[PDB]
Amino acid sequence: WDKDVYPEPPSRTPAPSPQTSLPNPITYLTKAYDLVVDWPVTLVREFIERQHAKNRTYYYHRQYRRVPDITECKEGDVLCIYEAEMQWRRDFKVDQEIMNIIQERLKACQQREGENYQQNCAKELEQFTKVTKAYQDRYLDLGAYYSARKCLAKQKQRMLEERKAARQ
């Protein structure tokens, strides 16, 4: 869990401040819980983690070097096109996960802010809208056969339209 990727604001819990003579059942139930249920489970987990400390192994996040893009090599060079298409598919798969991360951010903000979500989730909603526009301009309307070539064609059409409008 990285807070920078998944920002979670600081909690702001009020003090108990009881104002009655009756006992609060939830406090005693939580005490009984922290004894019966929370403690043996904690001990079992500590034993499991102690066993994990021995027999410890590491796994690495693979790194892919950038290869020539689709734009950088010739029409009908299947080797180039295959390299560029695999790279484009990797970047598309990662764009999907960035989309998912930001959607999770928005949903968590809505749940947390609760009744103030209309006013205290402005940052998350604006991020969603901007990143959503970017995603649409990149990938929307490409067939089930989407590919780097189709993405390039879409970008070039959009650039031509923008240029024509700027001229006019």
């Binding site: 969603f128 995603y135 649409q136 929307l140």
Partner: protein, 126 residues
């Protein structure tokens, strides 16, 4: 009578004029129908109670019904003006209707998108 029958609310029997006719012709007809019922029931009960029976009782009436509704429909079909008109209408008219519906909807949507007036906001999956 103040009760007017309908195809889905058929005329009762106690209100049926044909149930109160005592003519010997109708009486003979009813007796003949009961005789046919009795013969068929006797055969069925003999088969049903046969202690040596080792299988179910095949139903010639059911076989005839299934044959009529499946394999005998085409041999006894003759094209007619009404048959052809109904066939063409049922086969194609719905297709033409739904083609026009879908095509007009799609054309209006595409015109909207080309003009940029369609509010595609969070559409991301399509």
């Amino acid at each position: 009578s103040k009760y007017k029958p309908a195809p889905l609310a058929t005329l009762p029997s106690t209100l049926d004029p044909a149930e109160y006719d005592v003519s010997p012709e109708t009486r003979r007809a009813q007796v003949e129908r009961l005789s046919i019922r009795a013969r068929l029931k006797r055969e069925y009960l003999l088969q049903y109670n046969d202690p040596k029976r080792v299988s179910h009782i095949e139903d010639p009436a059911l076989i005839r019904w299934t044959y009529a509704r499946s394999a005998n429909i085409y041999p006894n079909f003759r094209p007619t003006p009404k048959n052809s008109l109904l066939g063409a209408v049922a086969g194609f008219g719905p297709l033409i209707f739904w083609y026009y519906v879908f095509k007009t909807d799609r054309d209006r949507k595409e015109r909207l998108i080309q003009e940029g007036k369609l509010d595609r906001k969070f559409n991301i999956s399509y």
